[PDB]
RNA sequence: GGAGGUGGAGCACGAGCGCACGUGUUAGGACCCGAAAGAUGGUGAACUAUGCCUGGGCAGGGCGAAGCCAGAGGAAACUCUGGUGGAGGUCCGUAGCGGUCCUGACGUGCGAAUCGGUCGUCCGACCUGGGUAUAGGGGCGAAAGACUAAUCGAACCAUCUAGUAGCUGGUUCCCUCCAAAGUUUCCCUCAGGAUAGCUGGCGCUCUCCGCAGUUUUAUCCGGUAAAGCGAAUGAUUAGAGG
RNA sequence: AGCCUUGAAGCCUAGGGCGCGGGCCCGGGUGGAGCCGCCGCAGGUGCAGAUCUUGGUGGUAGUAGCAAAUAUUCAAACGAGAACUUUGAAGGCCGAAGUGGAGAAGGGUUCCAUGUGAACAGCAGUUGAACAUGGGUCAGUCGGUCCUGAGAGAUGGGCGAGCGCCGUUCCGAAGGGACGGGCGAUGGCCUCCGUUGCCCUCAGCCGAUCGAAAGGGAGUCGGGUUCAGAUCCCCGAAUCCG
RNA sequence: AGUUCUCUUUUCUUUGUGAAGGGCAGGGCGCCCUGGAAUGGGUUCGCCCCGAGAGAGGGGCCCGUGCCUUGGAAAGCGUCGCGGUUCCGGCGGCGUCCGGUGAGCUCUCGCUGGCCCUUGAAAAUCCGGGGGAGAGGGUGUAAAUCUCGCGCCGGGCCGUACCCAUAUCCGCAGCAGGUCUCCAAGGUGAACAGCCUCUGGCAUGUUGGAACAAUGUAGGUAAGGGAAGUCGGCAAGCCGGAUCCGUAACUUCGGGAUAAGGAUUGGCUCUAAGGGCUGGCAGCCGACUUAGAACUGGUGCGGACCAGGGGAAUCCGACUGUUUAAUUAAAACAAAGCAUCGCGAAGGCCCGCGGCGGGUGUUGACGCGAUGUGAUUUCUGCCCAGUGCUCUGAAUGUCAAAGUGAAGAAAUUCAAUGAAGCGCGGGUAAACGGCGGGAGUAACUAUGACUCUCUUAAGGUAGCCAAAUGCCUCGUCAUCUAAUUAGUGACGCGCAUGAAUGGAUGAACGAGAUUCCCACUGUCCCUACCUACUAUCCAGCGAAACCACAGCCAAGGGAACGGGCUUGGCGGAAUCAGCGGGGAAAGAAGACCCUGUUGAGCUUGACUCUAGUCUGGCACGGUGAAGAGACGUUUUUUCACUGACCCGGUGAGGCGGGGGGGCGAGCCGGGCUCUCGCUUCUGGCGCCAAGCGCCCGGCCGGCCGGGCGCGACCCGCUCCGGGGACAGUGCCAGGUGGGGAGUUUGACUGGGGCGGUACACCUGUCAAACGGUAACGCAGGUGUCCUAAGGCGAGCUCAGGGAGGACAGAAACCUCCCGUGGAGCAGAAGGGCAAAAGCUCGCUUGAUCUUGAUUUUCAGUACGAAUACAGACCGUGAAAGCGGGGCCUCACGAUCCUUCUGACCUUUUGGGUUUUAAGCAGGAGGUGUCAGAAAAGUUACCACAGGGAUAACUGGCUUGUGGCGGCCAAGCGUUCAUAGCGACGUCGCUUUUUGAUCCUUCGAUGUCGGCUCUUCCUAUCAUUGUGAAGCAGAAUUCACCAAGCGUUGGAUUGUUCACCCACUAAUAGGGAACGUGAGCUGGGUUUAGACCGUCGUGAGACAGGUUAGUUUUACCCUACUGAUGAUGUGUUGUUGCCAUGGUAAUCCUGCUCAGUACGAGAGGAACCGCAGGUUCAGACAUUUGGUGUAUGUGCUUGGCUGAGGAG
């Protein structure tokens, strides 16, 4: 048999993000002594539209403390926020929303967003639009912090992490039927070369474990165990169940 | 050390070595020509496939979404009527892009895919230039095993390589003499080999008793043809007397 | 002590013969320089075939054919020669999505003048994009040149048997610059200023480099002019940059 | 300038001003000031705007490509007129003028809106602003400075022609292909449509002339009919623009919709309405529109061009979109929607030989990755047994290396321990998949709600169906027709329907499949005519395919279909146009089928591996506390540490500790518990130090200028965090591993496959009286069994029968008699056997050890089996003897390797001892394909070498079967065998059935059916002439001579076949390579795409359905059709003969005979005559019809010649 499809797409090629117009990483301020130590002030300046992404971006501005300069970050923008307000960011930074405080500082059942995993990483769960992250619990002995994810699974991250209050814009986007593969076309044209999706039965046996037969058939389980091989991983990957979700 | 059996490619008064010529068998390109393949290293995205960058392009009509104006009705909710408006992977239809049927033309063509009428679509998942990216068990595929320079169920180039072929085709002067086999056994043996038989050649040991695809005379061997079933085995018809 | 310019090989021949045959001898002609008998040696040594190789030639056969896109005619000229060239006049066609006028890519002299009519232009040609002999492309302002785009690609580093490969800010002492100030040295319109060396002071850019004759990118227009060039030449009037 | 016969103050051409600067229109402003607005107002095509300031006034700014002006009339152009060397930017006159209009077209500038789960580059480069470090002069000879106006100098390098495409580029070429752009006139018209014209261009597309045959290609037209044609309405045809009217089912309320169905349309002359400017009015200007009316023509008018046929349904797919470049455009693919699955980053998925590597990822679960289904509507049942996937694990079977323990001289052996994985247990079907059988039963019959029973993991639920899925099957009923294998609607024990392997539906849509209806028609009846280009003939020019030699037939035989050969018929130069019978014509070493110890793509439960991945050990690999062990050391568990190692952030910018200061608490002002480090209202600003303290320099306490410190705490060893002795990496070990690699996937065989085993053996037969002897010949057996069923000895005699004896009988046991084996001897059969070879006892291990010879198969090899001996040991018997397996004929296995037994055995390499190892001899472990490889599929995506050794057509032999025909005569026929039939039997013929066979063809003979066309057979349906009837007539039946002439139109089906409708004299049957594809067609079959069912894990398969799928060449020879001609008659002509060959007419209706013969009646003929018709043939055009480019004559649309006229 050929590579099949899925294995093509870890090699770059023609399966890379479309990066072209996007407007920069989107990141919180880099961790320094204002925000370790007290808070620092910023003017969200512009709301923009980043191509590939759901959420909105909020374009703010900070004073440099060591140097005559204006800083401009890129954050996810909380819903709610708007140009000309005033966001604060540091362990001394008001619970409002918009503002960027560390975990261990906010009571149980915060509402955040673009929260960091590790202590400095600059913001990397609950980022995409209509998501959020929940405070659970703190361990002051530890100098840790329970969090929920969007997922629903619980997390035990370090109390010095920070994250931006509020839950991201631009919720609700995935309510609306898109009703068209031409603005499926147009979707993906903006994220990657993914669409649209051929079916692995709908090919022939060379390309694809569950290709061939005088029946459009899988043939074989499509449940598929963990350890597969490359390009025999198709299917259900190391499901473990299968059906309807009858149930909680 | 003896006697008596038995295994040896031995001894029993050498015959070898060297060189040359022929024939045969074989290892080598191996009598000559012939695969589908496999391997190594390289050249291609000027066609086409797909992503990206930066440019160009798409008459005239039909239908008439939301919004809005006015008049009418109504207790309210709101309803009705006439206009305005100009949405749409919307419709007819040009350029363009495509290529349904005629199973039309042509079929040593204009053309290694073209031509005519008729047809699909024609603001979009649209058409298109150039730039750039992906390279061969690899790419790329709205998926036909499609496309990847007239090459694709694995490109092209050189080499390995005069690849192997129990299989097809061919195999070049004369006369003279002899002259077959398609059968036995073994073989992943059944289009092939080895093996015995059948042939040829070289002789040599004798001769001018031996032998014989023959009969004769003796002497054995045999269970087929025929016959038999009022003889065994098996099959089978009719009466008769007890 | 072979043959041969008093004629070798080769070739041709309704000439005379020999041999069962493979073949050979002699005669005549052409030819123009080498060749053969016998004893031995050696072999890339004998063709009718292989859809054999290469070259040549037939019949087919003066045959298929020279039928896509409406169309030609009259007179004259040159000339050996005219259905096809030139001029004039008619009749037609393309019918501004053109059979018009200009470019990009590609070509590369095909452009222009004169000459030829051998070959080629599937009839002909006095004609051609053929052949021959000579010419023709002029810029601060139109492009390239510069920028970056998707991307490509060195160094540091890493990997690697190795040619090398990965990687493009990532494991890097990555600045050779500057207003100014202070110490000197040299010169000149020697008055005092330049230049120049060192020290002090100040200093993010953070990625070499390449990447578009359609993107970004200052500034040229009118008239005339040649066989062929012109927003380039000449005339006139301007303008950007330094 | 054109026209002017007539008219036309006419028609045509032409009638400029660059850049840059200045000015002014015009356009735009989300710009300012006054003011304060509801009775809200302003305002656009739409909008939209306002107390966050509307209207109204007055200003400001930006673009001004428009106009004026400098440029600039000097130039350019038009026209007229003069000169020259006359190849001069030659010189002169005049002119280059005044207005209107527009949803017009093109370009551009601007305003305002809509769309996005789409938001639509970067950089070089240039500019403005904020700040104020600095500099400049001291009232002048002014300075620093100036983005102002002039002036001065320079701008190097490379490209630049021309073509730009029915002839400059790529397709071998001047190739009907391909190849990116800019400008874009008048008329008609909605129009960048088509049609005509101007500017510009061209010469008909690599030649011309003459004809006007066939057959073509491309256009047309056809009376009457109207799909009867055909697989199918293929093709053509109908409709078509616009206005006015009108419009159904159904529907997702959007559509359907141009539904359907009507009417109108020309020309001319008018009427009304719809506006602008200046000053309820007046005047002056204007732009095309709409509506209405009269008149008018031979009812013609969207007059050319342009330009939808319609309706009722069924299947499939929602739609738009995409696709096999070059045979498949589709129902396939995609799609929105739906549902699952993995993953929280040291992660999921993936790349990569490699790493601190790479993609997703400029990402973070509303995400990325992996699958299935396929809009909406409605629903999606049961099954976790199987196969998968998944979850739990010291409780725990198996389980590698390493490590631990014991034995030993050690190698080594043994033991304990026990990671993953497997086993074990849960979950899971929108995971792969799956979802029964029998019997009885309701008061007629039928069904059978109901019951019993076997049964699996469930036993098919809702639905749906002869569906693209049902074999039987052309199912049954109804509808549709005259007639229907078609369609539709129902039915449903459904070979083999069914629920996201999605079931059912349903509007809109479809170059998708199918049926019917209206309309239309040359599809047809049934063909004809016309036009253009060919073909044709000529001048010029000029190939190629192909070719053993060739080219007339019948039969024969022959490699079973001859051009050649045999026997006959016969044969006459050279040619032209056609033609498609033959050359089993050409084209390509057959793709089908088989074989090959030839492949390749793909699959998997094949064999052997392998990347990756999970898991354990060793190393990097450290520090310290506890717990549990073992004897101060050492193993292990937990908890910590950091310094290796890893990760993240940053321009490595304030880290740890202490000091200092502030608010609180509280003990008797001080000490501490202990916390804090100066920014939260506003879409400002924020650096390059102020201040203070202390030193220093230069000049005259005063000026000028420097340095340090505090401000800005001190000390510290990792920049700051997060992990961390683990990730991880290196090397080993176990597991997983069609993701990938290589390879295999027997043979025989009346083709192969399936089936068998005739593959190694044995008995009887075949087998033809020695032996041998074949077939997928016939009847059978074999892979064992036996401590005795081996060996010896002795003693007995068996099967069966007769007759007797308590229970006792057909059969128990006892007795006598007969008994040649009719029993038994393990087994298949054949042979053999009676004081034995059988049965019963006693004793035994000759079934032991050993060398040779021989026999059988045979090559005179092996094995196996067997035969005589010889040497030992033995058993048995009194002994002779007999016995080294079974009474005989079968009962079995090389090399290499392993294992055991044997010797005071040999070797173990410099010697010696000892373990070990290797030798030598004999057994065993096994190859059954049995003289002995280690081995699964599929290919319709397929490949190569071959094969007529071998299947799928025809032909050939045969003729079981099929068909047809006799003979005998029991019967039938009321009677009567034979008018007509005919049993039980039996003899033939035929090759239009199917077989059987495999002779020809696999370097190819085109595979069904129809269409068309000719010919032949007779086994005769009709017709002519006849014979016989159970022949009265009529009708019918049987038979003879007999193939001259006929044997038809249709519905369903691809059909051959079949069936039905209808007409008819009749509706006979057949051959010609199952006649006929260089004759067609391509419906079926039979490539590649795709769907369904059944089957398969799968790839895939199916004499099962379904849909779409390239049909090549003639100019050669012959034959045939026509056309010139040839011989020789001296030449030449006219008129003739006819040898030979062809050959043709056919059948039916009416009237009359005649309501007659005949007959009880009912019914009901015939000959002769008369009048017509059918089929066929040969003509013909007076008539009717068709054609019509006489391009004949009217009419007419658009355009063009100024108009008329003529065109
Ligand atoms: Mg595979
Ligand atoms: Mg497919
Ligand atoms: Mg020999
Ligand atoms: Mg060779
Ligand atoms: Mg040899
Ligand atoms: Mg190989
Ligand atoms: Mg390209
Ligand atoms: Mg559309
Ligand atoms: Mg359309
Ligand atoms: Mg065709
Ligand atoms: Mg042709
Ligand atoms: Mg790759
Ligand atoms: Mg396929
Ligand atoms: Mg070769
Ligand atoms: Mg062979
Ligand atoms: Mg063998
Ligand atoms: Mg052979
Ligand atoms: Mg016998
Ligand atoms: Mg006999
Ligand atoms: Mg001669
Ligand atoms: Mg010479
Ligand atoms: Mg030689
Ligand atoms: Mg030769
Ligand atoms: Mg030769
Ligand atoms: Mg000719
Ligand atoms: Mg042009
Ligand atoms: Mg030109
Ligand atoms: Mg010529
Ligand atoms: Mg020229
Ligand atoms: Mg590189
Ligand atoms: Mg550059
Ligand atoms: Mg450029
Ligand atoms: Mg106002
Ligand atoms: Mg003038
Ligand atoms: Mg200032
Ligand atoms: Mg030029
Ligand atoms: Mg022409
Ligand atoms: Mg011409
Ligand atoms: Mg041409
Ligand atoms: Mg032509
Ligand atoms: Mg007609
Ligand atoms: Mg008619
Ligand atoms: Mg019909
Ligand atoms: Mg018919
Ligand atoms: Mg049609
Ligand atoms: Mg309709
Ligand atoms: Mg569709
Ligand atoms: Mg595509
Ligand atoms: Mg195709
Ligand atoms: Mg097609
Ligand atoms: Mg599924
Ligand atoms: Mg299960
Ligand atoms: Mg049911
Ligand atoms: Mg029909
Ligand atoms: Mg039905
Ligand atoms: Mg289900
Ligand atoms: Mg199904
Ligand atoms: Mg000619
Ligand atoms: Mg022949
Ligand atoms: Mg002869
Ligand atoms: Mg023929
Ligand atoms: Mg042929
Ligand atoms: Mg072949
Ligand atoms: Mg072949
Ligand atoms: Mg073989
Ligand atoms: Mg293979
Ligand atoms: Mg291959
Ligand atoms: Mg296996
Ligand atoms: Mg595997
Ligand atoms: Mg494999
Ligand atoms: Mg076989
Ligand atoms: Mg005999
Ligand atoms: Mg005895
Ligand atoms: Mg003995
Ligand atoms: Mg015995
Ligand atoms: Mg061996
Ligand atoms: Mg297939
Ligand atoms: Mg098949
Ligand atoms: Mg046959
Ligand atoms: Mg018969
Ligand atoms: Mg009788
Ligand atoms: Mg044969
Ligand atoms: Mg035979
Ligand atoms: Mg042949
Ligand atoms: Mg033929
Ligand atoms: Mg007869
Ligand atoms: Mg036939
Ligand atoms: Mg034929
Ligand atoms: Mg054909
Ligand atoms: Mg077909
Ligand atoms: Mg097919
Ligand atoms: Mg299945
Ligand atoms: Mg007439
Ligand atoms: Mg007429
Ligand atoms: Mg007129």
């Not at 959420?55 to 970050?73: C, G, S």
């Not at 009571?107 to 992250?133: F, M």
């Not at 619980?154 to 609306?176: E, F, Q, T, Y």
């Not at 039927?177 to 499926?184: D, F, M, S, V």
């Amino acid at each position: 048999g050929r590579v099949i499809r899925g294995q093509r797409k870890g090699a770059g090629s023609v399966f890379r993000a479309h990066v072209k117009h996007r407007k920069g990483a989107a990141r919180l301020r880099a961790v320094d002594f204002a925000e370790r130590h007290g808070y620092i002030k910023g003017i969200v300046k512009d709301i923009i539209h980043d191509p590939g992404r759901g959420a909105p971006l909020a374009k703010v501005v900070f004073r440099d403390p060591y140097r005559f300069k204006k800083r401009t970050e890129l954050f996810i923008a909380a819903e709610g926020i708007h140009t000309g307000q005033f966001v604060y960011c540091g362990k001394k930074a008001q619970l409002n929303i918009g503002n960027v405080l560390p975990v261990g500082t906010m009571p149980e059942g915060t509402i955040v967003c673009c929260l960091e995993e590790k202590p400095g990483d600059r913001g990397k769960l609950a980022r995409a639009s209509g998501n959020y992250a929940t405070v659970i619990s703190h361990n002051p002995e530890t100098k840790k912090t329970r969090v929920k994810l969007p997922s629903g699974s619980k997390k035990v991250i370090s109390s010095a992490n920070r994250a931006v209050v509020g839950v991201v814009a631009g919720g609700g986007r995935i309510d609306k039927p898109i009703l068209k593969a031409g603005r499926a076309y147009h979707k993906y044209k903006a994220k990657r070369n993914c669409w649209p999706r051929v079916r692995g039965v709908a090919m022939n046996p060379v390309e694809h474990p569950f290709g061939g037969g005088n029946h459009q058939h899988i043939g074989k389980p499509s449940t598929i165990r963990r350890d597969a091989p490359a390009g025999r991983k198709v299917g259900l990957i190391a499901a473990r169940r299968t059906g309807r979700l009858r149930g909680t």
